[PDB]
Amino acid sequence: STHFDVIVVGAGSMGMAAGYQLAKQGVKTLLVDAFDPPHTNGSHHGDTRIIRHAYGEGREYVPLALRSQELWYELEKETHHKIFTKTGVLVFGPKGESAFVAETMEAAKEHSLTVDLLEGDEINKRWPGITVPENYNAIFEPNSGVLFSENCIRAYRELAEARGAKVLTHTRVEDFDISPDSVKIETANGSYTADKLIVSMGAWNSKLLSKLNLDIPLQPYRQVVGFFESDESKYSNDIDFPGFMVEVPNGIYYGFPSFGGCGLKLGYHTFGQKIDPDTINREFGVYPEDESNLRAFLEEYMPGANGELKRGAVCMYTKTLDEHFIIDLHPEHSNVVIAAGFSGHGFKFSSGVGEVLSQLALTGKTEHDISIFSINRPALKESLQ
Ligand SMILES: *Cc1cc2c(cc1C)nc1c(=O)[nH]c(=O)nc-1n2C[C@H](O)[C@H](O)[C@H](O)COP(=O)(O)OP(=O)(O)OC[C@H]1O[C@@H](n2cnc3c(N)ncnc32)[C@H](O)[C@@H]1O
Numbered sequence: 001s002t003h004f005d006v007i008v009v010g011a012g013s014m015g016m017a018a019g020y021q022l023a024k025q026g027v028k029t030l031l032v033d034a035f036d037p038p039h040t041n042g043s044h045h046g047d048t049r050i051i052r053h054a055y056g057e058g059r060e061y062v063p064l065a066l067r068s069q070e071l072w073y074e075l076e077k078e079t080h081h082k083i084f085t086k087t088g089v090l091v092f093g094p095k096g097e098s099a100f101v102a103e104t105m106e107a108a109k110e111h112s113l114t115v116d117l118l119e120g121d122e123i124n125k126r127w128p129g130i131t132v133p134e135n136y137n138a139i140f141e142p143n144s145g146v147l148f149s150e151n152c153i154r155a156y157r158e159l160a161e162a163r164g165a166k167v168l169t170h171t172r173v174e175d176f177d178i179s180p181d182s183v184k185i186e187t188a189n190g191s192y193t194a195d196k197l198i199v200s201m202g203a204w205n206s207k208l209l210s211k212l213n214l215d216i217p218l219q220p221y222r223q224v225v226g227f228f229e230s231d232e233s234k235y236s237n238d239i240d241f242p243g244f245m246v247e248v249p250n251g252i253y254y255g256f257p258s259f260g261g262c263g264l265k266l267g268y269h270t271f272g273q274k275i276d277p278d279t280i281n282r283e284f285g286v287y288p289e290d291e292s293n294l295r296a297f298l299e300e301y302m303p304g305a306n307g308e309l310k311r312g313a314v315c316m317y318t319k320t321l322d323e324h325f326i327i328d329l330h331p332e333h334s335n336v337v338i339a340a341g342f343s344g345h346g347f348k349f350s351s352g353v354g355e356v357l358s359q360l361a362l363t364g365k366t367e368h369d370i371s372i373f374s375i376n377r378p379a380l381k382e383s384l385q
């Protein structure tokens with residue numbers, strides 16, 4: 001009960017998905033987490049997460065986006081927890097002045113994705129509640145939408161445990177001991193060994209990968225989101241208000257329609273405070289920017305959603321220099337798999353990454369093309385310690 005086929009350190013978004021994929025195949029797995037997933041100390045809380053297919057960060061993410069979407073529909077059918085709502089996703093910005101909008105459109109064209117292209121008042125007409133200038137243009141993806149992130153992790157966990165996966169909670173891994181033919185982790189609750197290791201500690205990857213002789217630039221950011229009292233006749237998912245990710249002059253913002261009257265949810269993507277996951281302040285409102293940055297967007301583009309602040313949440317991104325993920329084998333240990341640096345946009349791919357991680361851990365290879373997430377790519381600035 002202390003040696004396993006595979007050990008996953010960090011059973012959050014990526015780790016729990018990998019655990020489900022491994023258990024599903026009869027592989028004896030141990031998932032270890034410092035807390036009890038899903039929780040509010042990592043990067044997966046706040047209830048909802050956007051999934052987009054036409055991908056503004058890069059058209060090369062489309063295949064993984066589509067596989068992940070199919071896997072989310074499979075999860076929906078396997079659990080009693082709500083997984084996905086097809087709100088559609090709206091992307092807009094000043095015409096010819098948004099690289100994000102442009103790449104989303106190009107990604108759609110290249111993968112033959114279903115989208116609606118509109119501009120100026122056509123946007124305001126279609127979605128009462130949105131007020132953009134006449135020079136703005138947009139691309140709407142009707143078949144993408146919103147995932148209930150905490151539900152996703154809970155379902156994957158329940159399914160994996162039912163299949164035999166063991167989950168050791170409130171147990172912080174403090175060190176690693178890797179050998180040619182096995183792996184070992186040290187915790188205050190005991191040491192555990194296995195044949196393969198998957199490391200997916202989220203924001204903590206920036207602090208602990210050095211324990212694996214890895215020196216990779218990874219910066220954790222404090223990123224808040226606020227839920228606002230809104231005009232339900234305009235912003236409710238029931239009246240088809242969409243999820244959105246947009247780029248305006250001062251940056252990128254993302255939001256969600258109000259679900260069951262929870263209020264419209266908004267986040268500012270471009271800015272966040274550089275922090276350490278062990279000292280970060282998880283209280284919303286301690287920095288003037290928390291609420292002011294959100295209201296400045298709402299007052300200008302979605303005025304009817306600028307009501308009382310119903311709830312605020314504080315979460316973390318873990319950025320790489322090029323803002324692309326790290327999914328690969330440890331350069332010096334083929335029996336160690338690393339999943340890190342999701343840079344604020346990886347939850348939607350967590351179902352697909354779970355699959356990738358499972359394959360890398362069991363075979364050292366994957367049917368997916370993950371070259372752009374290579375741990376040895378130059379733009380990363382990686383090296384040994
Ligand atoms: C924060 C945030 C992120 C975000 C977003 C909005 C906010 C405010 N909106 C998104 C969206 O609309 N669409 C999307 O695709 N992504 C969005 N994101 C990003 C996404 O949430 C993150 O990329 C994702 O959650 C990253 O997942 P990962 O699995 O890396 O991180 P985690 O879920 O935090 O899990 C890490 C786990 O590891 C554990 N841990 C940490 N250290 C240890 C040690 N030492 N020992 C054992 N376990 C450890 C944590 O407890 C955690 O469970």
Ligand SMILES: [Cl-]
Nearest residue numbers: 317318343344
């Ligand atoms: Cl992240």
